[PDB]
Structure formats: C-alpha cells, structure tokens
Amino acid sequence: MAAASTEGVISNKQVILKDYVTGFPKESDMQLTTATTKLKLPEGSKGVLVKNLYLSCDPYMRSRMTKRAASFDAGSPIVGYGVAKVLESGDPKFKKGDLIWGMTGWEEYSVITSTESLFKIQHIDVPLSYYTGILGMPGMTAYAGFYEICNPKKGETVFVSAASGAVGQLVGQFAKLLGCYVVGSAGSKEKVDLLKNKFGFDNAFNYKEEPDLDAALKRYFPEGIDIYFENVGGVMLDAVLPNMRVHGRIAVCGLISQYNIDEGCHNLMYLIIKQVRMQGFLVFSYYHLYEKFLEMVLPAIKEGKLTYVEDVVEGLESAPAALIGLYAGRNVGKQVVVVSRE
Ligand SMILES: NC(=O)c1ccc[n+]([C@@H]2O[C@H](COP(=O)([O-])OP(=O)(O)OC[C@H]3O[C@@H](n4cnc5c(N)ncnc54)[C@H](OP(=O)(O)O)[C@@H]3O)[C@@H](O)[C@H]2O)c1
Ligand SMILES: COc1cc(/C=C/C(=O)O)ccc1O
Ligand code: NA
Ligand code: NA
Secondary structure (H helix, E strand, C coil): CCCCCCCCEEEEEEEEECCCCCCCCCHHHEEEEEEEEECCCCCCCCCEEEEEEEEECCCCHHHHCCCCCCCCCCCCECEEEEEEEEEEECCCCCCCCCEEEEEEECECEEEECCCCCCEECCCCCCCHHHHHCCCCHHHHHHHHHHHHHCCCCCCCEEEECCCCCCCHHHHHHHHHHCCCEEEEEECCHHHHHHHHHCCCCCEEEEHHHCCCHHHHHHHHCCCCEEEEEECCCCHHHHHHHHHEEEEEEEEECCCHHHCCCCCCCCCCHHHHHCCCEEEECCHHHHHHHHHHHHHHHHHHHHCCCCCCCEEEEECHHHHHHHHHHHHHCCCCCEEEEECCCC
16 A cells, blocks of 8 residues: 655656667666656746657667767666657646657656747647657658658659668658659568558568678669668668669668667769769758648548558557667567557
C-alpha cells in the first residue's frame, strides 16, 4: 500500500542519459528512473506543462550523446520530438487538453519553457503518432529534400537509401506520384517487400545480400540514376556515384552508416564526369513550408494517395532499445514510442 502525497507529488518516469557515448550506443548508456513532479508550471512561465503521449526515435539523436544542436546533459532526461497534451500553459494560445508536437522530454511529464517552437495540432482524424513522422519532422524532411533540393521531374530515375524508413518511404511515394521510376535499398527481405508492395516502388533490393552494389544498381538503373536521395553514406554512396546520370543530383539528407564509427568517399571524380550537384540540407530551414506541406499531405493521406508505416513500441521502458535499434535496422518504418495513449 502507498498513500497519495498530501503535497500533490506524483511519479514521473524518465529516461536519463547516464554518460556520454563513444562508438555505438548501448541500452546501459541510459537509465530508467522514477522522479517526482508537482504538475504545476513554474511561476512566471510562458511555457506549457505537458503529458507526453508519443516519442520519436530519430537517427540524429545519437550525435547529442557525444559531449561537445547542443549535446544532451549527462544526468538529465533525453529530449527529442514528441506529441504531448497540455496540462497548464503560460501562453493563452494553448489550453488544457490541446495537443502539440515539438521537442519534449523522455519522461511522462515535461515543462517546455517556450512555446515558440511548438505546433498546436488541429487535425486529429489521423493517428496522433503521425505527428512524430509523416506529419512531423521526418515528413517535412522528405518534402523539402525531394521537392526543394532534388529538382525532380516526371520520368527521372530516383534511388533512395534506407528507403523503408521514416523519410525514405515518403520520398519514394512523392517520386512515384510525380511519375518517376523509383528504386529503394533496405536491410531485409521484409523491408524490400514493403517497398514494392505497400509503397509502390518500381523495385527494391536488400543491400546486405548484395556483394556487388555496382551490379545491383546497374540491374535496376541500366541508364543510370538522375536523383539519389542519400540517407546512409558509406559503401552505398561510393556505389551510386559511378551510376549517376549527367546533371544528376544527390540530396545529402543523412549519412547514418557513419554516426557511430568511421569512412572515406572514394568516387567523387564522378561529380565532375557526370556534372552532379551533391547538396546537403537541414529540415529546420524549411519549417516556414510546414502549413503548405500539411495542406498537401493531409488530403493525400485521407484519399489513400499516401500511406505510412510506423514501428510502435510500448512504454518509456522500451525507448532505449528502440533508439539504439535504429543503428541496427531494428525498426520497420518510422520508430515511435507510446508513453501514454491519452
Ligand atoms: N534535416 C535533415 O537533414 C534530416 C532530418 C531527418 C533525418 N535525416 C536523416 O535521414 C536519414 C533517415 O532518417 P529516418 O528518420 O528516415 O531513419 P529510418 O530510416 O527510419 O531509420 C534508420 C535506418 O537506417 C538504416 N541503417 C542504419 N545503420 C545503417 C548502416 N550502417 N548502413 C545502412 N543503413 C543503415 C536502417 O535501415 P535498413 O534496415 O534499411 O538498413 C534503419 O532502419 C538518417 O540518416 C537521418 O539522419 C536528416
Ligand atoms: C534533424 O535531423 C538531422 C539533423 C542533422 C544536423 C543538425 C544540425 O547540424 O544542426 C543531421 C542529421 C539529421 O538526421
Ligand atoms: Na531519366
Ligand atoms: Na551507424
């Protein structure tokens, strides 16, 4: 038996970063703990006290576990994108019961000191977890990278790495809707089948089973690649470079094969031979397009023109393993943690 607190103290489970990470992250680099909270905003707060509902696992989070976005603080909760319910607000834009997405804590209850970088959700006729993926930062990344960086055109050939993931699965669908020929690489038969059968990619292959990536790309792109949407780097980038078309483009979205350990790109001469534009981008520079993105994507989801696959795990207790799993390809589609459905 446990008495209720006569001071309104309740339990707040948290995922702490125990210490900074070298090499690949391990579950034991994080600690599940139970903190206490009074569900009350600090005096003068212009922010929100929220109940966290869903948390995103995103590849960039590993970089914040290295001591030097600013690093995570050892001894403090992991932070990252999530979907939350407002309990109390210092900003009358938000009231109790409103749903938000934005950066929040890996904990049951967070205080978010400023609301300037929160989005108030209005459309709730989709799974709320979508606001960590297709309707959040990964969806924005796919939209900006494909439409704003790749200068895509009907009939162009498109190759996507990590193609069944949060970003890649949308890039391929956008490209198919534009009338492009689209191929994806992924790390399992299950993901290759998902690309062809759920997302409508023209083709896909399992890079882990291909000893000769150049021959795999030539199988699918006998006249080369107009657009490479780069999520992985490493061996796949070297294999792609000789297969680019003249005036081809490489949108450098991510390089996840290098996030935990080093790797040299050896085929850059093909940028000259094929007059290729290889261009990095950050989703943050395109958030001004978010409302225009939602005007396109919401009806497309409703009409079944776009679809999405999430990997959902239950409880904060699952969050450390779900985050480390990104670097092993454990996720099938966009990795979500359910902290609380309501
Ligand atoms: N603003 C930005 O520029 C921006 C924003 C968001 C994301 N990104 C980048 O976009 C990429 C995809 O993000 P996402 O959220 O869509 O992740 P995701 O694809 O849902 O998950 C990561 C995937 O990476 C693949 N992977 C992991 N280690 C690998 C390796 N060593 N070699 C090849 N593939 C590996 C795995 O897929 P397989 O099973 O297929 O191997 C894994 O499922 C990441 O590089 C991320 O950093 C950049
Ligand atoms: C949002 O996701 C990403 C962001 C970055 C870079 C951020 C910065 O340089 O400020 C890199 C890879 C990512 O997946
Ligand atoms: Na073409
Ligand atoms: Na990695």
